[PDB]
Write a protein that binds this ligand. Structure first.
Ligand SMILES: NC(=O)c1ccc[n+]([C@@H]2O[C@H](COP(=O)([O-])OP(=O)(O)OC[C@H]3O[C@@H](n4cnc5c(N)ncnc54)[C@H](O)[C@@H]3O)[C@@H](O)[C@H]2O)c1
Ligand SMILES: NC(=O)c1ccc[n+]([C@@H]2O[C@H](COP(=O)([O-])OP(=O)(O)OC[C@H]3O[C@@H](n4cnc5c(N)ncnc54)[C@H](O)[C@@H]3O)[C@@H](O)[C@H]2O)c1
Ligand SMILES: CC[C@@H](O)[C@H](N)C(=O)O
Ligand SMILES: CC[C@@H](O)[C@H](N)C(=O)O
Lengths: 314, 308
């Protein structure tokens, strides 16, 4: 039995059916504080900041594994750091302690490049490096990585984590993040509307397409224990680009659209993160691999976004 | 009005009177969950894990600055991780949030070399380095440094912190801490009793004498805000030595002294930490300096432990 926390988010929206197709709908339980269609998969309300609720869910459903996705992202976290701290910090502690107290075999946590700060090298950053985040989001995530590793070393609980770069997807619409522009831009492109980008034209960031992000998280979950040395904090990425480069590439497909740059607080956040990551450790220790390069995800996004907005009929 | 949390600990035992002498008796308030003598200085019971208690105390005493010393250390943290998290993580968050809302103006937090882990370079480690702690204590402390810096950058709360190595002192009794062997050893030496050391004979660690530890904390506190760059995570140290080296030096003074090594979980904790630190940033930004070298602290300890 697999429990997914924060299932209604950008990742959960796709991870839940992904897990169900691979392990069976009856073996997956979706949960969040906000319910959304789960395609026939069992959904339970669960606030991770409430340890009592986690205990009850884990007990009632004999949970064997937890994909802990519940949390407040970088942007939303800066608007309300107190909320980010409660949900991210204490929510993760609750999940770890609950898993340990009950007999949950594995806990998988999606970390982020948000654990990095200004002092972290900007190019091809390895997994073991400087981690001095400057956002509440980043502080809570590096703490989660450290607590996860501690729960394994101290109690033997199988906790694993990877650090995702910005994730591009079309099934769910991201809202509380900093890398969301990489998704938003496609909607404006397909509608031939001028896009107002909130990041600097040259703000380079590591990114990856949802299909690969899902495969990576499940590959880590299924990885052989004998090769998991780093265990927590694996850098993963597919490619790096700036808003001006992505715009330029989308234009090669849809020339009748434009962009203007009006930076806000999110560009200040992105400025503290590295431009590209070195994912060699993830590939060496558990076979991490990418199937969608930039060209492929661009054409795939235009494809699905067009059908979603009725540009290309059903 | 300065509030000191965890005032009954090794540092607080000496910091309270130290602050009183420098800023006046009426301007210092001692607090802890365990009350001990403060020589007339006002004392109040305060559990930092309880946000309400902090809010009330800060309001009632018009606290302007806080020296947050409350916390569970490395050894006790491994025996009871949940307690370390509750006290260290929840407690520090509560202190910062309470200080942010209520009109608190300065917060000093003693960090530790415990924020380092196996991947951290072992020699002359700079302040900006790998910080992947492997103890609950270390995890809560690196989080403390990060939250502190965050509150400063986000809300303008003047939070400052330095990373102490092991601290040697004689006024407060040791509490079986990972680095406390460096204090216990003196008690056995003065009594000419064989000492049973729980750290390996060659377990090298950075250390410093309390007089310098106190001066460093206050120097950091007094530094002009807009002149601190690093602000949180300042590596500070006086010297590096192993148990066998300290033993050998003590023996030069008390030749009858003997020692045996029975390493336990505390040696495993120590093994994940660096041997020596680079403290140039602290010196350059706020004038950190050392007045007691190894020989001087050894003789000063024997002197004080003896007359005692
Ligand atoms: N999307 C990305 O590009 C990306 C990158 C790196 C890391 N991550 C991590 O992945 C996880 C989810 O990402 P996402 O993009 O799907 O986020 P999202 O913002 O789309 O969804 C977050 C979910 O958290 C839920 N939530 C908030 N508080 C909760 C609580 N107390 N209990 C249960 N649920 C709660 C929300 O209701 C929401 O459904 C987070 O931990 C995030 O930090 C995401
Ligand atoms: N002593 C050192 O060598 C050293 C080195 C590096 C960092 N530090 C840091 O300095 C601080 C104190 O060090 P110390 O040596 O004086 O510690 P100590 O062990 O001597 O004292 C700790 C104090 O914390 C108190 N305490 C526990 N829970 C509390 C709570 N909920 N509310 C209020 N007080 C509580 C204890 O009763 C005790 O008096 C800690 O934050 C520690 O991490 C100390
Ligand atoms: C690396 C980016 C992620 O943390 C998330 N998409 C965010 O924007 O906060
Ligand atoms: C660096 C050592 C300090 O953290 C404290 N004296 C301890 O023994 O944990």
């Amino acid at each position: 039995m697999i429990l997914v926390t924060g299932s209604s988010g950008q990742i959960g929206t796709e991870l839940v059916p992904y897990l169900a197709e691979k392990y069976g709908k009856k073996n997956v339980i979706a949960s969040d504080i906000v319910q959304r269609d789960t395609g026939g998969i069992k959904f339970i309300t669960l606030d991770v900041s409430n340890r009592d609720e986690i205990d009850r869910a884990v007990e009632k459903y004999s949970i064997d594994a937890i994909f802990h996705l519940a949390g407040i992202l970088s942007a939303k976290g800066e608007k309300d750091p107190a909320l980010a701290y409660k949900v991210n910090m204490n929510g993760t502690y609750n999940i770890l302690e609950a898993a340990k107290q009950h007999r949950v075999e594995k806990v998988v946590i999606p970390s982020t490049i948000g654990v990095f700060g200004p002092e972290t090298p900007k190019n091809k950053v390895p997994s073991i490096t400087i981690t001095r985040p400057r956002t509440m989001f980043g502080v809570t995530k590096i703490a989660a990585e450290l607590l996860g590793q501690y729960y394994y070393e101290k109690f033997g609980l199988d906790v694993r984590s990877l650090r995702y770069p910005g994730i591009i997807s079309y099934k769910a619409e991201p809202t509380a993040g900093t890398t969301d522009y990489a998704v938003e831009i496609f909607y404006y492109a397909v509608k031939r509307e001028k896009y107002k980008c909130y990041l600097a034209p040259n703000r380079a960031l590591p990114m990856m397409y949802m299909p690969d992000a899902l495969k990576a998280l499940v590959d880590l979950y299924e990885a052989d224990r004998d090769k998991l040395v780093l265990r927590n904090g694996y850098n993963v990425t597919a490619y790096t680009f700036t808003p001006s480069e992505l715009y330029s590439k989308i234009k090669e497909r849809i020339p009748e659209f434009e962009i203007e740059y009006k930076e806000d607080f999110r560009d200040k956040i992105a400025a503290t993160w590295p431009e590209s990551l070195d994912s060699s450790e993830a590939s060496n220790e558990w076979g991490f691999s990418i199937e969608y390069d930039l060209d492929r995800t661009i054409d795939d996004m235009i494809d699905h976004i067009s059908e979603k907005l009725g540009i290309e009929g059903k």
